[PDB]
Each structure stands twice: as C-alpha cells, then as structure tokens.
C-alpha cells in the first residue's frame, strides 16, 4: 500500500537528480 | 550501466542484489516487491545453454545497497531463498521470451531508509506509461562498458521506443513480452544496461500518484550502448496474471 | 574485491 515512495524522497518531499526529466519525458 | 552516473543514497531501494554464495559474486540485479518477493530475470537463475541452473541454496539476495563489493553493516539486510519461481513459459531456448522470476525470502525483510518496495502496473498504469518517447529508469553495478565494474550503483534515465523500431534494430523475435528502450544515435544522449544489470528494474514515476512503478525487467542486448541498438525489458504487466498467481498461491 | 559478509548468511 506504501510501495513506489521513498523513504528519502517522497516520503520527505525531496526530489532526487534526475526524476524531474523523466516527468519531463511524459508530454501525453 | 554504460554511461549513467552514480545513485543517490536511498534513490533505488527497491534494487536487489542477487548474490552467488561460492565462489562470492554479483550473479544479476533484481528488486524488492513486497516485505517476502523479488522479482528478476529467469534467465539469471536458468540459462541451461550456459550450464546456468541455481538452486536456492547456492544464493543470497543483498538489499538496500549503494556499494557494489563493502558490505554495508547497519544498511544491507541479507536474505536467504526459501523457493524459487521461473515462469512456465520462459523461453531460454530462443529469445529469453517471458524473462522473469520470482524469489521468495525465508524471512520478511524489515523496511528502512534503504529498503522499500516498488510498486507493480495495472492495466491503467502500463497504458498510459508505456509510450515510446517516455522515459524510465534503470539501475545496476553491472560492467561500465561493453569491454570495468562500478564502486557504486549506477543509474540512467532511458526513453522506451516505438516498437518498429526495436525490431528493425535486431534479427532477434521480439514479441509483445518484450519493449525496447535507448537514444538512437547521434541524439546527443547515450546510455544503456550492460552485464551484471540484468534483473534489474526498469521503473517509471507515476504523474498521476508520484509512486514508482516497475514496468520491465533488464532482460538482453546486443552488446552495451551500441549505436542503433536498444536494451530489451521484459514487459512486467504482461506477465502479471503470472505473478499474481503465484504469489497469492504461495504467498 | 568483495568483503566477507557475516558467517551466519552463508
Ligand atoms: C541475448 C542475451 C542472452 O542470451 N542472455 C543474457 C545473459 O545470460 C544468458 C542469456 N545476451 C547474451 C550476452 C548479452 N550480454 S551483453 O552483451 O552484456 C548486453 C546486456 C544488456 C544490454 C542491455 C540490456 Cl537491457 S541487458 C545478452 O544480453
Ligand atoms: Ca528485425
Ligand atoms: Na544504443
């Protein structure tokens, strides 16, 4: 139920290096 | 990986190591689904033409690392395999079609900053994800070049491409269990899985829910970050009737 | 190259 959020990313709301290019990538 | 760059601490904790016992190697990647799977390649457990045949005792799983070769007391926790689970259908005869297995853990491993599972696809999740052009995620301490090997887990952010042409870039049969994914040439941009990645996830984070899906497995290639040539991932959603089989029969 | 992991895992 908790899976897919990190627990040093999501779940802190912080954003790691690259993440911001993949939803970059998701034009559709 | 070729050409990606080192993980972040904790950016991956879903990624597995698979281990072999003796002699005490990285045998492939692999990732965390649930406090008792892995999943990974079939093809990293079973590969008779190679004389590849693992049986649970001849291996450990190794989560939440970042260090490929230290051994990361107070970080990694080390699992042992209760049962093995090769799809039925895995091609290791042709084209390594259906390339997935499961692994289930002796004993349930405790969450942390360094461990936590990714989510699996629904029919949602795959359709509007899976779209050439969208990019996706992959992870491993696989060779750092064709023809050495990582200090660190590597990351590389690769887009998935249109399946003509995937097909177009090799002999081998794709079929619909498989989707390709790399820049073509002189995009400006190169990147790839490589030996000792395979296993590994392919992950894609939700717009819609911020959650990281899995939506392949790194399953081959022909060679490593060759121009006109793309990494090829087992479709994971494909093959979730098969999944969740097996986990609810024997979970 | 690796380092040993705890002889209770093998
Ligand atoms: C076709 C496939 C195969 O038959 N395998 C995989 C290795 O284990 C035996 C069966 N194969 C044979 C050797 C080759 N390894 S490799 O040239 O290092 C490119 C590894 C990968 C590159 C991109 C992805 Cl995804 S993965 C490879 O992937
Ligand atoms: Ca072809
Ligand atoms: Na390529």
Redesign the interface.
């Known amino acids: 139920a908790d899976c897919g959020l990190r627990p040093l990313f999501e779940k802190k709301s912080l954003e790691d290096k690259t993440e911001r290019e993949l939803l970059e990538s998701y034009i559709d | 990986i070729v050409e990606g760059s080192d993980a972040?601490?904790?950016?991956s904790?879903w990624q597995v190591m698979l281990f072999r016992?003796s002699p005490?190697?990285?045998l492939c990647g692999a990732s965390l689904?649930s406090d008792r799977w892995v999943l990974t390649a079939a093809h990293c457990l079973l590969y008779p033409p190679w004389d590849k045949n693992f049986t649970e005792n001849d291996l450990?799983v190794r989560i939440g690392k970042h260090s490929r070769?230290?051994?990361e007391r107070n970080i990694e926790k080390?699992s042992?395999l209760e049962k093995i689970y090769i799809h039925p259908r895995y091609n290791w005869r042709e084209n390594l079609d259906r390339d997935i297995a499961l692994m289930k853990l002796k004993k349930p491993v405790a969450?942390?900053?360094y461990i936590?599972?990714?989510?699996?696809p629904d029919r949602e999740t795959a359709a509007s994800?899976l779209?050439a052009?969208?990019?996706?995620?992959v992870t491993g301490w696989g060779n750092l070049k064709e023809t050495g090997q990582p200090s660190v887990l590597q990351?590389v952010?690769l887009?998935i491409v249109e399946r003509p042409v995937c097909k177009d870039s090799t002999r081998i049969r794709i079929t619909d269990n498989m989707f390709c994914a790399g820049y073509k040439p002189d995009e400006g941009k190169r990147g790839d899985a490589c030996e000792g990645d395979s296993g590994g996830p392919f992950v894609?984070?939700?717009?819609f829910n911020?959650?990281?899906?899995q939506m392949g497995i790194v399953s081959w290639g022909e060679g490593c970050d060759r121009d006109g040539k793309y990494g090829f991932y087992t479709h994971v959603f494909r093959l979730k009737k098969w999944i969740q089989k097996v986990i609810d029969q024997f979970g | 190259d690796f380092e040993e992991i705890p002889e209770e895992y093998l």
């Open positions: 972040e601490i904790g950016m904790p016992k005490q190697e990285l689904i450990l070769t230290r051994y080390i042992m969450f942390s900053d936590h599972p990714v989510c699996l994800l779209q052009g969208y990019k996706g995620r990351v952010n887009p894609m984070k939700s717009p911020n959650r990281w899906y």
